Design a protein around this ligand. Sequence first.
Ligand SMILES: Nc1ncnc2c1ncn2[C@@H]1O[C@H](COP(=O)(O)OP(=O)(O)O)[C@@H](O)[C@H]1O
Ligand SMILES: Nc1ncnc2c1ncn2[C@@H]1O[C@H](COP(=O)(O)OP(=O)(O)O)[C@@H](O)[C@H]1O
Ligand SMILES: Nc1ncnc2c1ncn2[C@@H]1O[C@H](COP(=O)(O)OP(=O)(O)O)[C@@H](O)[C@H]1O
Ligand SMILES: Nc1ncnc2c1ncn2[C@@H]1O[C@H](COP(=O)(O)OP(=O)(O)O)[C@@H](O)[C@H]1O
Lengths: 705, 705
Amino acid sequence: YLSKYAIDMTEQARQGKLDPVIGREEEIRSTIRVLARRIKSNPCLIGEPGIGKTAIIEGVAQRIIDDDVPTILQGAKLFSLDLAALTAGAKYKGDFEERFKGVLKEIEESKTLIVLFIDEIHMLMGNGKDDAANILKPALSRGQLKVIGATTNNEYRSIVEKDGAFERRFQKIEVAEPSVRQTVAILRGLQPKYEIHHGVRILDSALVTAAQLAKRYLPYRRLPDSALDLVDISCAGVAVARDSKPEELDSKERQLQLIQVEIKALERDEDADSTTKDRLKLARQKEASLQEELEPLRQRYNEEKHGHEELTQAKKKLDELENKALDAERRYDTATAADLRYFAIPDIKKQIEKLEDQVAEEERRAGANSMIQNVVDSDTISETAARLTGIPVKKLSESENEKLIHMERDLSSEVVGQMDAIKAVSNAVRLSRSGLANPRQPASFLFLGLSGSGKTELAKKVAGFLFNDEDMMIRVDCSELSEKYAVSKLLGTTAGYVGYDEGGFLTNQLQYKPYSVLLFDEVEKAHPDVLTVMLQMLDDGRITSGQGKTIDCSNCIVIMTSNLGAEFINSQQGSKIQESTKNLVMGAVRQHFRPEFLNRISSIVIFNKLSRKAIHKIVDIRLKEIEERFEQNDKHYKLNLTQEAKDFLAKYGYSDDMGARPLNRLIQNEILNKLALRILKNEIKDKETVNVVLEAEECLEVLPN
Amino acid sequence: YLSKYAIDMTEQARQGKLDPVIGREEEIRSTIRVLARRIKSNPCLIGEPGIGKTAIIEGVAQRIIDDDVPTILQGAKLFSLDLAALTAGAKYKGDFEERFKGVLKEIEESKTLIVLFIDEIHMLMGNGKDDAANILKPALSRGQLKVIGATTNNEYRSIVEKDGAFERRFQKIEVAEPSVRQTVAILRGLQPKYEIHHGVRILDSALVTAAQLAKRYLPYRRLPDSALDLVDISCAGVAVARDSKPEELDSKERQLQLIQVEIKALERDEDADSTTKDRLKLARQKEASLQEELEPLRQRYNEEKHGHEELTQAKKKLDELENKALDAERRYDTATAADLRYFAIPDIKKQIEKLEDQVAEEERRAGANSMIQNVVDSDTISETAARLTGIPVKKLSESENEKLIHMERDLSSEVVGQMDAIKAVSNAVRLSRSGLANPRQPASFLFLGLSGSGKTELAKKVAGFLFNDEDMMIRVDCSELSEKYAVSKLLGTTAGYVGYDEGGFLTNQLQYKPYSVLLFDEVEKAHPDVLTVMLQMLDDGRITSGQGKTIDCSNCIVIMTSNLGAEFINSQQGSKIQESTKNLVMGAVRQHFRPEFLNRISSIVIFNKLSRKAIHKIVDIRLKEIEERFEQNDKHYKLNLTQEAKDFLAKYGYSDDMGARPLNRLIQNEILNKLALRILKNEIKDKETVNVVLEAEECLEVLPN
Ligand SMILES: Nc1ncnc2c1ncn2[C@@H]1O[C@H](COP(=O)(O)OP(=O)(O)O)[C@@H](O)[C@H]1O
Ligand SMILES: Nc1ncnc2c1ncn2[C@@H]1O[C@H](COP(=O)(O)OP(=O)(O)O)[C@@H](O)[C@H]1O
Ligand SMILES: Nc1ncnc2c1ncn2[C@@H]1O[C@H](COP(=O)(O)OP(=O)(O)O)[C@@H](O)[C@H]1O
Ligand SMILES: Nc1ncnc2c1ncn2[C@@H]1O[C@H](COP(=O)(O)OP(=O)(O)O)[C@@H](O)[C@H]1O
């Protein structure tokens, strides 16, 4: 029977068993217009699967119930036919086929216009036709059977390369991820569902931050989903908080126990006549005192709890009344709609407001009540995210804009000098955003000046501030870009060719890190073909993967690096790269890259010869970096390098061969080895001081012990 | 019929029998949070076999027991439904299905929210899915039918990838292995259960050491359970060792009984009256003397045992009274709580205090009388470990610091030559072990140098030293790691391809050895991709399979050997390698590997030519080794190596083309073979100790008689 597994979605939705659908109307209308088409009556939802898409289909079911359809579809009924219909519904080979033909024939059989839909449209045609109604359904569609399908970009793209008839039969509609703003409106629409689900209110701001954070920190998941995860999760987290009632009750009740236990113990003994044991009477006074606290505590918890329960039920009833009104209105049973629309629905609205007054959010806190409700925009959602993303509130709390005026400073704290570079970079980061640059034109730079200048480290630190994650960066070995430029290429292995490794670095990492910075290590050595795909990446960087052939590029900040101007930089005797010298570098830039590439870069930036005066500061930054993390602070050298270690390190550090790079071999192989030893030998146990105990570099720093 | 189909975990918790665990409170709150979630309502505990998933859920049930569960779930009941419930009832296809549906109907209607727990998600779906719940279950989710699942990280990924359905209703909860510290706390929590079962009290420090030992020596076993395995096993060890009541007694009772029988046999005999047999009277004095010691041992053990059992029961009873009293207080039934708190509880608590005082404890032991059977923290655990892992004495003598302190010395006593290297390596290891180094990256170094000169032998000795086991090393033939790198790459084959020994050579061995030494033989010849893969999982040692399973052995010391510097080694510029020849080598290193590789290695060693000075001595050392290897006391040669053997061997030994390598052959070819001949003659009973007496290499040793 069709009744097995096929779900009458219009009946389901009619019964109020369908969530309201918000902000999809254009896609829904498109779907309906397709169903209306006399020939190509079969729409298909395409795009990114985390977006769900199904709500659109369900939106159609709702339109059918309410008949907000073209009337040629007035008699339509919409059914969900999927998975279990062919899988759980089958025991032996061939049952699969019968579930199709059996049901589908019943679908044709007389009972008005039936539209079916399959959310995994890909289940049909299997992985290579096998008549998983691959032919049958089309045959049946000749016989009216209108079908709504849903798929993914990966799926139909493979389908049309194996078939193509599907495409000829289907009107693909891509489902767009809603903007955060749209998402919030959506969340508001769904807000009472979640409030009901958990017995909590949700701060409107929380709806906002859920969308913002879902988007900002969990972008790998499509926003409608991710946002709702923050909502239902955070709401549940609050529901868990709503069961913290016992923490106060048990504190007092456990104290009653200790007292009740002592009272009998105290009641009879050799010393019963002494004030030592007669304290029993005081124990009873304390047992009573705790009861005095427990009475208003328990009463408060229950009064407030009831206010939340009543609020919740009022919201449930408002929604049930509206569901019924909507049914009655299309039925033209407006008298019964009136029973809901007049007085009842608005009265419940007013009951809800009064019940929120019982919840009593007050100037004292987010709910005067002890239930703890009101998902908090900041702390609740943020911590929810912390549970999902990790990293502390700083990550989760920013004005954003402010980074331009703080991050450039903090960056100068992380790396020494290069302030002009820092400003240039910082500027593109916040200004490309606030400047509303084409969103597919993320900040991008070419980092010139030489290795050892920290230009790379800057970018790393920038990732730090941009994403609260230095390891957000995607590094690309551009020197490993020979004529083969295959898997390692931004595109990776071409679809259908051997090797499923695609987008060597780019897909492979952006798919996990959509918000990221990418860095091209010695980009100057890249094969021109790569430089060409990079050109694309630098502007409208819509890079298509090797196998999937999908694109996901936006906030993909790009830093390219080179030692391209080295002779010019070597010539420079000062710090700030001199005029003309910089032009010599530009000459070389133009030799290596075409203007069409270069013009896409937010800025070409040449890093300065920071020299001694800078490394003199770098050594403190590095030194404290090491100790600041350490393990646990049960040590703490004064970190008093003094000019001895600072300068010996600088001399042993800032080599023109690699600038400051040796610094991180220094320390390690000069003192850290000793720290470990002296500490593990139990010579050194806490604190300590830094100084130098005086062949090349033979003093080797050597700290006090 | 549910009781046929599943175990009421919650009721069992009411009945106890579910040992409580700690350290999973967040997992539990999360489980609950998910269960509270109304959309993705079903949690899964994902981790490792033995990760904690079972107890976590039983802990969840405990939250139900004590009303620490939100109103949504508060009245819920938890059942364990698995294996027997899934397949034992199968006689034909159909039991599972009807049994399954039966359950779902019973847990859904009327009888609150009965929640199911699937202990093994593996059993769901299974090999081919077969609607083993997985299809109808979520289809039926409209009935809530709340369920908790659990599996491993690896299996989890494969089921999600195959599914895309339960995924949409479930919330993954990752379960971390508890730290050693956490584990110990847990061990303490369960210690009584062991002490109770076994009749073996255990010194607290045992638990401390057990967790340490478990992590350290029971490679693939997880702490919350494997530590217990050491406990359970060692408890049993003691339980067995004590045999007849405590240790000491058993052995003396065995003497007593052997004596008792002898005496009685002597008492009635042909010559019983002769001093030949009448000596039984003195044997009787021994029987009696033993009896006089044995009785106190028995009595101390037994009376204390009685107290031990009384403590066992008293503590159980204490918990029962509090559990019931809590039920009473959460219901506000102060009368019942009082009945279970006044007298009830003072009685049990005082029994416990009195009993513990009667048992009493000493600094030497957690039981002043006998019910400890002299169990000793590390000694008895270590011996347990020795039985499980071997190397008794060095496992006993395992101080981290005795090693770290003398590390380079001890290593130099085994390895002779570039002691500087030994120091360098030692230091790197110290940094790693000390946590001074970034804890994600174990020490590792490039290892160049003259062949046949102990480069890998050092690694063996390091492994020896660090693990008390030369077998701890894993070796990699890097030259075979051409572009082909597949089953042979660390990750192994990409899952989905034929063959699942995915880096078995690498990853699985690494799995078996989570603390280890790994050496790359001719790392310079590895394909750049391989080097990259290694590098990426070299620092931040996230060893990961083709299925995405990470071993993460941040504890592996890695050696990256090659012949890269051979052209400079061949310069023969001294024994200790002349400075600047080393620079040329390092130049070559810098050119043979991308600097990024070199940016992560912790160090580099280029082994010195030993010259005649050292090899003349080294050979003597291996001759010692040969004897050390020998199985019995009929050798123990000094071997008259005088100078002549050292010279013979040196002359025909230390070649630039193979170094000391062929010395085992010289020794074998001439020494062992000549010994074999004489041994064969069997005219040798001990010592041997012979010298060199004589075309090519004419001395040929040739040993005397
Ligand atoms: N504006 C919205 N209003 C209601 N639901 C929405 C809205 N936007 C997205 N959704 C739905 O939330 C659900 C998340 O996807 P879901 O349907 O659960 O997964 P899938 O369709 O892949 O099985 C989808 O139906 C999605 O369409
Ligand atoms: N605080 C700092 N300011 C500027 N540079 C720094 C700072 N700390 C470290 N560095 C240097 O930045 C460099 C990062 O490497 P990089 O310059 O890109 O060299 P390479 O291109 O050889 O990898 C290192 O030389 C590192 O020491
Ligand atoms: N002390 C403990 N801490 C946490 N879990 C424990 C402890 N003792 C036993 N267990 C549980 O037993 C399980 C291992 O045994 P078992 O219950 O059969 O489950 P598993 O399938 O994981 O092996 C662990 O998952 C763990 O939950
Ligand atoms: N001082 C030494 N200590 C230990 N082994 C040494 C020493 N000198 C030479 N050798 C020998 O080098 C041989 C193996 O040399 P090694 O360089 O590690 O191997 P390979 O050349 O096979 O890579 C061993 O027989 C080892 O004893």
